[PDB]
Design a protein around this motif. Structure first.
Motif, PDB file in Angstrom:
ATOM      1  N   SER A  93       0.845  -0.900   0.031  1.00  0.00           N
ATOM      2  CA  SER A  93       0.154  -0.186  -0.090  1.00  0.00           C
ATOM      3  C   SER A  93       1.002   0.957   0.525  1.00  0.00           C
ATOM      4  O   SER A  93       0.202   2.251  -0.564  1.00  0.00           O
ATOM      5  CB  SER A  93      -1.041   0.149   1.344  1.00  0.00           C
ATOM      6  N   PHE A  94       2.093   1.152   0.162  1.00  0.00           N
ATOM      7  CA  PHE A  94       2.853   2.043   0.369  1.00  0.00           C
ATOM      8  C   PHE A  94       3.071   2.637  -1.297  1.00  0.00           C
ATOM      9  O   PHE A  94       3.174   2.603  -2.091  1.00  0.00           O
ATOM     10  CB  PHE A  94       4.592   2.103   1.372  1.00  0.00           C
ATOM     11  N   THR A  95       3.161   3.715  -1.050  1.00  0.00           N
ATOM     12  CA  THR A  95       3.339   5.158  -2.299  1.00  0.00           C
ATOM     13  C   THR A  95       4.670   6.230  -2.176  1.00  0.00           C
ATOM     14  O   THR A  95       4.216   6.907  -1.056  1.00  0.00           O
ATOM     15  CB  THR A  95       2.180   5.427  -2.539  1.00  0.00           C
ATOM     16  N   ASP A  97       4.657   8.514  -4.105  1.00  0.00           N
ATOM     17  CA  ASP A  97       4.139   9.925  -4.886  1.00  0.00           C
ATOM     18  C   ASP A  97       4.283  10.604  -3.197  1.00  0.00           C
ATOM     19  O   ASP A  97       4.368  11.953  -3.458  1.00  0.00           O
ATOM     20  CB  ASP A  97       2.623   9.545  -5.073  1.00  0.00           C
ATOM     21  N   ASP A  98       4.309  10.303  -2.059  1.00  0.00           N
ATOM     22  CA  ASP A  98       3.918  11.354  -0.644  1.00  0.00           C
ATOM     23  C   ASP A  98       4.359  10.818   0.293  1.00  0.00           C
ATOM     24  O   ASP A  98       4.260  10.680   1.458  1.00  0.00           O
ATOM     25  CB  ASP A  98       2.517  11.639  -0.887  1.00  0.00           C
ATOM     26  N   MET A  99       5.466   9.234   0.093  1.00  0.00           N
ATOM     27  CA  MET A  99       5.679   8.786   0.908  1.00  0.00           C
ATOM     28  C   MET A  99       4.375   8.595   2.434  1.00  0.00           C
ATOM     29  O   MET A  99       4.571   8.263   3.442  1.00  0.00           O
ATOM     30  CB  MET A  99       6.792   9.943   2.149  1.00  0.00           C
ATOM     31  N   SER A 100       3.285   8.146   2.011  1.00  0.00           N
ATOM     32  CA  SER A 100       2.478   7.043   2.353  1.00  0.00           C
ATOM     33  C   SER A 100       1.965   5.836   1.829  1.00  0.00           C
ATOM     34  O   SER A 100       2.307   5.815   1.464  1.00  0.00           O
ATOM     35  CB  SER A 100       1.196   8.120   2.126  1.00  0.00           C
ATOM     36  N   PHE A 131      13.053   2.184   5.060  1.00  0.00           N
ATOM     37  CA  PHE A 131      12.915   0.844   4.353  1.00  0.00           C
ATOM     38  C   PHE A 131      12.565   0.673   3.535  1.00  0.00           C
ATOM     39  O   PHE A 131      12.434   0.125   1.957  1.00  0.00           O
ATOM     40  CB  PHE A 131      12.448   0.152   6.237  1.00  0.00           C
ATOM     41  N   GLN A 132      10.553   1.580   4.118  1.00  0.00           N
ATOM     42  CA  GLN A 132       9.726   1.505   2.515  1.00  0.00           C
ATOM     43  C   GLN A 132      10.229   2.222   1.419  1.00  0.00           C
ATOM     44  O   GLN A 132       9.704   0.942   0.772  1.00  0.00           O
ATOM     45  CB  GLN A 132       8.370   2.850   3.100  1.00  0.00           C
ATOM     46  N   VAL A 133      10.883   2.897   1.151  1.00  0.00           N
ATOM     47  CA  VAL A 133      11.631   3.767  -0.216  1.00  0.00           C
ATOM     48  C   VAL A 133      12.238   2.382  -0.631  1.00  0.00           C
ATOM     49  O   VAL A 133      12.701   2.211  -2.417  1.00  0.00           O
ATOM     50  CB  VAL A 133      12.200   4.724  -0.217  1.00  0.00           C
ATOM     51  N   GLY A 134      13.398   1.833   0.311  1.00  0.00           N
ATOM     52  CA  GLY A 134      14.118   1.054  -0.267  1.00  0.00           C
ATOM     53  C   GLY A 134      13.776   0.223  -0.709  1.00  0.00           C
ATOM     54  O   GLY A 134      14.068  -0.702  -2.163  1.00  0.00           O
TER      55      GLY A 134
END
Ligand SMILES: C=C1[C@H](O)CC(=C/C=C2\CCC[C@]3(C)/C(=C(/C)CCCC(C)(C)O)CC[C@@H]23)C[C@H]1O
Lengths: 240, 12
Positions: A93-95, A97-100, A131-134
């Protein structure tokens, strides 16, 4: 090529994930409502986490070999890994686009401020977002995603594990499946050092687990906050 | 430890 057993493992893990991860997030309507306006987001996010724990359990029971473990060891692995698998599965669900975490509607879009309104600080949230971005940036195949969750759960080095040899044996079968999958099905250039990067993500998750545990311990110590949790969260994460 | 809920969810 992937052996027939390896193809079997992947098919089972894909199905297990589809059976336990609703990409419409329809059940979120059953949760206590989110409030943004203290710890206003704790009831909602506690219910999200409780629900997610139930789903992580359902997925885990389907991991080939997981059933051959004793219930004691099944318990230790699930207790230790729950938050890490929720962090992993949340990447869906992480995006960036705006780090959410965007679960379909404004009500169900969680940003850094929402998480801090559940009792957590940047000491956790900053590395959590990194972590989520990586993880996103790895552009994992769903096949790789589900193997990584499975490897995360069946980790022989979790504290309290009794039959570590058997846990390691099950994890090796998944690990080898993942390495072969990468070799045979993930084309270069995206496959460059992909297994080593996936394993590093498991390392990052251990640090996130530690810091979450520390902040949760502090959160739950306040009886007014623990009143807002669920019985399953208290059982899995701790009851002061 | 007693984990009745986790135990329940783990059942076959
Ligand atoms: C179904 C889904 C969807 O992908 C939405 C999900 C988002 C996950 C999030 C966004 C909200 C905050 C989440 C749950 C998080 C935390 C460490 C907050 C924990 C709160 C508490 C249990 C009180 O410590 C780490 C992972 C964070 C959970 C996942 O299982």
């Amino acid at each position: 090529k992937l052996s027939e057993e390896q193809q079997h493992i992947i098919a089972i893990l894909l199905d297990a994930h589809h059976k336990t991860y609703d990409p419409t997030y329809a059940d979120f309507r059953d949760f206590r409502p989110p409030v943004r306006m203290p710890l206003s987001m704790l009831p909602h996010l506690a219910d999200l986490v409780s629900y997610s724990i139930q789903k992580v359990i359902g997925f885990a029971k389907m991991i080939p070999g997981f059933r051959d473990l004793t219930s004691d060891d099944q318990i230790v692995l699930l207790k230790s890994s729950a938050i890490e698998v929720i962090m992993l599965r949340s990447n869906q669900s992480f995006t960036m686009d705006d780090m959410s975490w965007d679960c379909g509607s404004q009500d169900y879009k969680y940003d850094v401020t929402d998480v801090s309104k559940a009792g957590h600080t940047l000491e956790l949230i900053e590395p959590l977002i990194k972590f989520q971005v990586g993880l996103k940036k790895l552009n994992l195949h769903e096949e790789e995603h589900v193997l990584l969750m499975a490897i995360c759960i069946v980790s022989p080095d979790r504290p309290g594990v009794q039959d570590a040899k058997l846990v390691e044996a099950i994890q090796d079968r998944l690990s080898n499946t993942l390495q072969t999958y990468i070799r045979c099905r993930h084309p270069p250039p995206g496959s460059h050092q992909l297994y080593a990067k996936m394993i590093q993500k498991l390392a990052d998750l251990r640090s996130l687990n530690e810091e979450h545990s520390k902040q949760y311990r502090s959160l739950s110590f306040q009886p007014e906050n623990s009143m807002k949790l669920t019985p399953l969260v208290l059982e899995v994460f701790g009851n002061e | 430890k007693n984990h009745p809920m986790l135990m329940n969810l783990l059942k076959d």
